Coordinates of C-alpha atoms and ligand atoms in Angstrom, one line a residue:
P1 CA 0.0 0.0 0.0
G2 CA 1.5 3.2 -1.2
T3 CA 2.6 6.3 0.7
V4 CA -0.4 8.7 1.3
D5 CA 0.2 12.1 -0.3
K6 CA -1.9 15.1 -1.2
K7 CA -3.1 13.6 -4.5
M8 CA -4.3 10.4 -2.9
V9 CA -6.2 12.2 -0.2
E10 CA -7.7 14.4 -2.9
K11 CA -8.9 11.4 -4.9
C12 CA -10.4 9.8 -1.8
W13 CA -12.4 12.9 -1.1
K14 CA -13.8 13.0 -4.6
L15 CA -14.7 9.3 -4.4
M16 CA -16.5 9.9 -1.1
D17 CA -18.4 12.8 -2.6
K18 CA -19.6 10.6 -5.5
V19 CA -20.9 8.0 -3.0
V20 CA -22.7 10.6 -1.0
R21 CA -24.4 12.1 -4.1
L22 CA -25.4 8.6 -5.3
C23 CA -26.9 8.0 -1.8
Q24 CA -28.8 11.3 -1.6
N25 CA -31.0 10.1 -4.4
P26 CA -34.6 10.5 -3.1
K27 CA -35.6 7.2 -4.7
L28 CA -33.4 5.3 -2.2
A29 CA -35.3 7.1 0.6
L30 CA -32.6 6.2 3.1
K31 CA -33.8 6.6 6.7
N32 CA -31.3 8.2 8.9
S33 CA -31.0 5.0 11.1
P34 CA -27.5 3.7 11.8
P35 CA -25.4 3.0 9.9
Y36 CA -26.4 6.2 8.1
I37 CA -24.0 6.6 5.1
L38 CA -24.9 10.2 4.6
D39 CA -23.6 11.0 8.0
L40 CA -20.7 8.5 8.1
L41 CA -18.8 9.8 5.1
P42 CA -18.9 13.5 6.0
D43 CA -17.9 12.4 9.5
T44 CA -15.0 10.4 8.0
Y45 CA -14.0 13.4 5.9
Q46 CA -14.1 15.6 9.0
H47 CA -11.9 13.3 11.1
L48 CA -9.4 13.0 8.3
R49 CA -9.2 16.8 8.2
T50 CA -8.5 16.7 11.9
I51 CA -5.7 14.2 11.3
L52 CA -4.2 16.2 8.4
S53 CA -4.4 19.4 10.6
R54 CA -2.5 17.7 13.5
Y55 CA 0.1 16.6 10.9
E56 CA 0.5 19.9 9.0
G57 CA 4.1 20.3 7.9
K58 CA 4.5 16.6 8.8
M59 CA 2.7 15.0 5.8
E60 CA 5.8 12.9 5.1
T61 CA 5.6 11.2 8.5
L62 CA 1.8 10.7 8.4
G63 CA 1.9 9.5 4.8
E64 CA 4.3 6.7 5.7
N65 CA 2.4 5.5 8.8
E66 CA 1.4 1.9 8.0
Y67 CA -2.1 2.0 9.6
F68 CA -2.8 5.2 7.7
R69 CA -1.6 3.8 4.4
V70 CA -3.7 0.7 4.9
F71 CA -6.7 2.7 6.0
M72 CA -6.6 5.1 3.0
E73 CA -6.1 2.1 0.6
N74 CA -9.2 0.5 2.1
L75 CA -11.2 3.7 2.0
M76 CA -10.5 4.1 -1.7
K77 CA -11.3 0.5 -2.4
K78 CA -14.6 0.6 -0.4
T79 CA -15.8 3.8 -2.0
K80 CA -15.0 2.4 -5.5
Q81 CA -16.9 -0.8 -4.5
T82 CA -19.9 1.3 -3.5
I83 CA -19.8 3.3 -6.8
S84 CA -19.5 0.0 -8.7
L85 CA -22.5 -1.4 -6.8
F86 CA -24.8 1.5 -8.0
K87 CA -23.5 1.2 -11.6
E88 CA -24.2 -2.5 -11.7
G89 CA -27.3 -2.3 -9.6
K90 CA -29.2 0.2 -11.8
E91 CA -32.9 0.4 -10.9
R92 CA -32.6 -2.5 -8.4
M93 CA -31.1 0.1 -6.0
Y94 CA -34.6 1.5 -5.5
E95 CA -36.0 -1.9 -4.4
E96 CA -35.7 -1.8 -0.6
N97 CA -35.1 -5.6 -0.5
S98 CA -32.9 -6.2 -3.6
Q99 CA -29.6 -7.8 -3.0
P100 CA -27.8 -4.7 -4.4
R101 CA -29.6 -2.6 -1.8
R102 CA -28.8 -5.1 1.0
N103 CA -25.2 -4.9 -0.2
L104 CA -25.3 -1.1 0.3
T105 CA -26.3 -1.7 3.9
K106 CA -23.4 -4.0 4.3
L107 CA -21.0 -1.4 2.9
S108 CA -22.6 1.2 5.1
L109 CA -21.8 -0.9 8.2
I110 CA -18.2 -1.3 7.0
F111 CA -17.9 2.5 6.6
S112 CA -19.2 2.8 10.2
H113 CA -16.6 0.3 11.5
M114 CA -13.9 2.1 9.6
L115 CA -14.8 5.4 11.2
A116 CA -14.9 3.9 14.6
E117 CA -11.5 2.3 14.0
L118 CA -10.0 5.6 12.7
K119 CA -11.3 7.5 15.7
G120 CA -9.9 4.8 18.0
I121 CA -6.4 4.9 16.5
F122 CA -6.3 8.6 15.8
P123 CA -8.2 10.1 18.8
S124 CA -8.2 13.9 18.4
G125 CA -6.2 13.4 15.1
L126 CA -2.9 12.2 16.6
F127 CA -1.7 8.6 15.9
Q128 CA -2.1 6.5 19.1
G129 CA -2.2 3.0 17.6
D130 CA 1.0 2.0 19.5
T131 CA -0.6 3.0 22.9
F132 CA -4.0 1.4 22.3
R133 CA -5.3 -0.2 25.5
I134 CA -6.9 -3.6 24.9
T135 CA -9.7 -4.0 27.4
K136 CA -9.4 -7.6 28.5
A137 CA -6.1 -8.4 30.3
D138 CA -5.4 -11.8 28.8
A139 CA -6.1 -10.5 25.3
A140 CA -3.8 -7.6 25.9
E141 CA -1.0 -9.9 27.0
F142 CA -1.5 -12.0 23.9
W143 CA -1.2 -9.1 21.6
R144 CA 1.9 -7.7 23.3
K145 CA 3.6 -11.1 23.3
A146 CA 2.8 -11.9 19.6
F147 CA 3.0 -8.4 18.1
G148 CA 4.4 -5.9 20.5
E149 CA 3.0 -2.4 19.8
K150 CA 1.9 -3.1 16.3
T151 CA -1.4 -1.5 15.3
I152 CA -2.3 -3.9 12.5
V153 CA -1.2 -7.4 11.5
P154 CA -1.9 -9.2 8.2
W155 CA -4.6 -11.9 8.7
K156 CA -2.2 -14.7 7.7
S157 CA 0.1 -13.7 10.6
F158 CA -2.7 -13.0 13.0
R159 CA -4.1 -16.5 12.3
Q160 CA -0.7 -18.2 12.9
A161 CA -0.2 -16.3 16.2
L162 CA -3.7 -16.9 17.5
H163 CA -3.5 -20.6 16.6
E164 CA -0.8 -21.1 19.1
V165 CA -3.2 -20.5 22.0
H166 CA -6.7 -21.0 20.4
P167 CA -6.5 -23.5 17.5
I168 CA -8.1 -22.6 14.2
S169 CA -8.6 -26.2 13.2
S170 CA -10.0 -25.9 9.7
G171 CA -10.0 -23.6 6.7
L172 CA -13.8 -23.0 6.9
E173 CA -13.5 -22.1 10.5
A174 CA -10.8 -19.6 9.6
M175 CA -12.9 -18.0 7.0
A176 CA -15.9 -17.6 9.4
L177 CA -13.6 -16.2 12.1
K178 CA -12.0 -13.8 9.7
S179 CA -15.5 -12.5 8.7
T180 CA -16.3 -11.9 12.4
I181 CA -13.1 -10.2 13.4
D182 CA -12.1 -8.3 10.2
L183 CA -14.7 -5.6 10.6
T184 CA -13.1 -3.3 8.0
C185 CA -12.9 -6.2 5.5
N186 CA -9.4 -5.6 4.4
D187 CA -7.4 -8.7 5.4
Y188 CA -5.7 -6.9 8.3
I189 CA -6.5 -7.3 12.0
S190 CA -6.1 -4.1 14.0
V191 CA -5.6 -3.8 17.7
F192 CA -9.0 -2.1 17.7
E193 CA -10.8 -5.0 15.9
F194 CA -9.0 -7.5 18.2
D195 CA -10.2 -5.5 21.3
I196 CA -13.8 -5.6 20.0
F197 CA -13.7 -9.3 19.3
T198 CA -12.2 -10.3 22.6
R199 CA -14.7 -8.1 24.6
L200 CA -17.6 -9.7 22.7
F201 CA -16.4 -13.3 23.1
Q202 CA -14.9 -13.2 26.5
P203 CA -13.6 -15.0 28.5
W204 CA -10.4 -15.4 26.7
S205 CA -10.0 -18.9 28.2
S206 CA -12.8 -20.3 25.9
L207 CA -12.6 -17.6 23.2
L208 CA -13.4 -19.6 20.1
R209 CA -16.0 -21.9 21.7
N210 CA -17.8 -18.8 23.0
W211 CA -17.7 -17.4 19.4
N212 CA -19.1 -20.6 17.9
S213 CA -21.8 -21.0 20.5
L214 CA -22.9 -17.3 20.4
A215 CA -22.2 -16.2 16.8
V216 CA -22.5 -19.4 14.7
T217 CA -24.9 -21.9 16.4
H218 CA -27.3 -19.7 18.4
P219 CA -30.7 -18.9 16.8
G220 CA -31.0 -15.7 18.9
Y221 CA -28.0 -14.0 17.3
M222 CA -29.0 -11.1 15.0
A223 CA -25.6 -9.6 14.2
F224 CA -25.9 -5.8 13.7
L225 CA -29.4 -4.4 14.2
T226 CA -30.9 -1.2 15.5
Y227 CA -33.2 -1.2 18.5
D228 CA -36.2 -0.4 16.3
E229 CA -35.4 -3.5 14.2
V230 CA -35.1 -5.5 17.3
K231 CA -38.5 -4.3 18.5
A232 CA -40.0 -4.9 15.1
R233 CA -38.7 -8.5 15.2
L234 CA -39.9 -9.3 18.7
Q235 CA -43.3 -7.6 18.3
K236 CA -44.3 -10.8 16.3
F237 CA -43.8 -12.6 19.6
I238 CA -45.4 -10.1 21.9
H239 CA -47.8 -12.8 23.1
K240 CA -44.9 -15.2 23.9
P241 CA -43.2 -13.8 27.0
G242 CA -39.6 -14.8 27.2
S243 CA -39.0 -14.5 23.5
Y244 CA -35.6 -12.8 23.0
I245 CA -32.8 -12.0 20.5
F246 CA -29.4 -10.4 21.0
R247 CA -27.6 -8.0 18.7
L248 CA -24.5 -6.0 18.0
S249 CA -24.8 -2.2 17.7
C250 CA -22.7 -0.3 15.1
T251 CA -22.8 2.8 17.2
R252 CA -21.2 1.0 20.3
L253 CA -18.8 -1.7 19.1
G254 CA -17.7 -4.4 21.6
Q255 CA -21.1 -4.6 23.4
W256 CA -24.1 -6.9 23.2
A257 CA -27.7 -5.9 23.6
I258 CA -30.5 -8.4 24.5
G259 CA -34.1 -7.6 23.6
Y260 CA -36.9 -9.6 25.2
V261 CA -40.6 -9.8 25.5
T262 CA -42.0 -9.3 29.0
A263 CA -44.9 -10.9 30.7
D264 CA -46.8 -7.6 30.7
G265 CA -46.9 -6.8 27.0
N266 CA -43.6 -4.9 26.7
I267 CA -40.3 -5.2 24.9
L268 CA -37.2 -4.3 26.9
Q269 CA -33.5 -4.5 26.3
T270 CA -30.6 -5.2 28.6
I271 CA -26.9 -4.5 28.0
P272 CA -25.0 -7.1 30.1
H273 CA -22.2 -5.6 32.2
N274 CA -19.3 -7.3 33.9
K275 CA -20.7 -10.6 32.7
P276 CA -19.8 -12.6 29.6
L277 CA -22.8 -12.9 27.2
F278 CA -23.2 -16.6 27.7
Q279 CA -23.5 -16.2 31.5
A280 CA -26.0 -13.4 30.9
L281 CA -28.0 -15.8 28.7
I282 CA -27.8 -18.7 31.2
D283 CA -28.9 -16.4 34.1
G284 CA -31.7 -15.0 32.0
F285 CA -32.9 -18.4 31.0
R286 CA -33.0 -19.6 34.6
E287 CA -34.7 -16.4 35.6
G288 CA -37.5 -16.7 32.9
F289 CA -36.5 -13.7 30.8
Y290 CA -34.6 -15.4 27.9
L291 CA -36.5 -18.6 27.1
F292 CA -37.4 -18.6 23.3
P293 CA -34.6 -17.4 21.0
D294 CA -36.2 -15.6 18.1
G295 CA -39.4 -17.0 19.5
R296 CA -38.3 -20.6 19.0
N297 CA -39.5 -23.2 21.5
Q298 CA -36.0 -24.8 21.9
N299 CA -33.2 -22.8 23.7
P300 CA -29.5 -23.7 23.4
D301 CA -27.7 -25.1 26.4
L302 CA -24.6 -22.9 27.0
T303 CA -23.6 -24.4 30.3
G304 CA -20.9 -26.4 28.6
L305 CA -19.1 -23.1 28.3
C306 CA -18.9 -22.8 32.1
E307 CA -15.6 -23.6 33.9
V308 CA -6.4 -21.6 28.5
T309 CA -6.1 -25.1 29.9
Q310 CA -5.0 -28.1 27.8
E311 CA -8.7 -29.3 28.0
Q312 CA -9.9 -26.0 26.5
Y313 CA -7.4 -26.3 23.7
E314 CA -8.6 -29.8 22.8
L315 CA -12.2 -28.8 23.0
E316 CA -11.6 -25.9 20.6
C317 CA -9.6 -28.1 18.3
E318 CA -12.5 -30.6 18.1
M319 CA -15.1 -27.8 17.6
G320 CA -12.9 -26.4 14.8
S321 CA -12.6 -29.7 13.1
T322 CA -16.4 -30.3 13.2
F323 CA -17.0 -26.7 12.1
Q324 CA -16.6 -27.4 8.4
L325 CA -19.4 -30.0 8.2
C326 CA -22.8 -29.1 7.0
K327 CA -24.9 -29.6 10.1
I328 CA -28.0 -30.7 8.2
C329 CA -26.4 -33.9 6.8
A330 CA -23.3 -34.0 9.1
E331 CA -21.4 -35.4 6.1
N332 CA -20.6 -32.9 3.4
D333 CA -18.6 -29.7 4.0
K334 CA -20.4 -26.4 4.0
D335 CA -20.2 -25.0 0.5
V336 CA -23.0 -22.4 0.1
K337 CA -24.2 -19.4 2.1
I338 CA -27.8 -18.3 2.1
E339 CA -28.6 -14.6 2.0
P340 CA -29.8 -12.8 4.0
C341 CA -29.7 -15.1 7.0
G342 CA -26.0 -16.0 6.4
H343 CA -26.5 -19.7 7.3
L344 CA -24.0 -22.1 5.8
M345 CA -24.8 -25.6 4.5
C346 CA -23.9 -27.9 1.6
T347 CA -25.7 -27.5 -1.7
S348 CA -27.0 -31.1 -1.4
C349 CA -29.1 -30.3 1.6
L350 CA -30.4 -27.0 0.1
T351 CA -31.5 -28.8 -3.1
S352 CA -33.2 -31.6 -1.1
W353 CA -35.1 -29.0 0.9
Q354 CA -36.2 -27.2 -2.3
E355 CA -37.1 -30.4 -4.1
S356 CA -39.4 -31.4 -1.2
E357 CA -41.2 -28.1 -1.7
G358 CA -39.5 -26.6 1.4
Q359 CA -39.9 -22.8 1.7
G360 CA -37.1 -20.4 2.5
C361 CA -33.9 -21.4 4.4
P362 CA -33.6 -25.0 5.5
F363 CA -32.6 -23.9 9.0
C364 CA -34.7 -20.7 9.6
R365 CA -37.3 -20.4 6.8
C366 CA -36.1 -16.9 6.0
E367 CA -36.9 -16.1 2.4
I368 CA -33.8 -16.8 0.2
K369 CA -32.8 -13.6 -1.6
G370 CA -29.8 -15.3 -3.0
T371 CA -27.0 -17.7 -2.4
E372 CA -23.2 -17.4 -2.6
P373 CA -20.7 -20.3 -3.1
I374 CA -18.1 -20.7 -0.4
Ligands
NA1 NA1 -9.5 -5.2 9.1
ZN2 ZN1 -25.6 -31.0 4.0
ZN3 ZN1 -31.2 -19.3 7.5

């Protein structure tokens, strides 16, 4: 990734301007709900101006900073990808539920994560990547031992280092993990992304089993939603007290929020504090609040996560080995992803479901907007 100079910054601002103008189109009728691309790109522009200001008469130093170089390459690639999406999408961009339009939401989330990361690494415009404080102590010790004060690490190197303490036992597991951690979708892991991941999937001692059981195999997991989208989803279960879902929030990375239907006709949400999510969900099940994930009658049993020992390493190795298998047949490897639910399976099981007249996704019955080969 090349040195950042005045010309490159100029080209990025023009590319951002084009994306903003494409997204102002009244026919898209974007609601200002997060991630709101019409605020994010102006806000990213503004924070870059703050950086450039702090580095006035020091552009040669800023322009060589590795994080900054990688960020500006990604900003240019992501804006070009968004412009390309409109060009190829044509009138489908105006269909609220088209895949092109859902792809715009995905890019908008990425722009949101990129701005959060930039603000975290350049608070007030000054590079502070090398003094970034990782929240969880074990995760912080891991990063320092493997990487020192580095702000970003190529995925290939991050994987090899993490594997030494938390085995990544299969290629498919690695791809799923990368999609979870690499928020900015650029094949680098920053200290900021690592901080987020290790807060979400604490405790460190069972990191990857926590991730699998919360983000892969749990029907209550909604990934990034707004609170209005959570309420909209649970309102369908307003007459089933104990129905619950849990989500990430693009405006507050590193935290979970659990929405649930009460016994009195209300929907509330709780942000768990000083408690891993799985313990929050065990407690809430026992207490009668979190009974029916996404309104389903069956709730996962997370107590196997209760207690890096040698035993943890072996449990994670086994989970990672089984990860690649399609869980409908338990025979073929996963090789297709359903959109928009994101569930993975083999194409044999998808076909069999469809040939039997089965509707929507074989796991969750969500309508299939498209599929993507793995
Ligand atoms: Na990244
Ligand atoms: Zn299968
Ligand atoms: Zn599904």
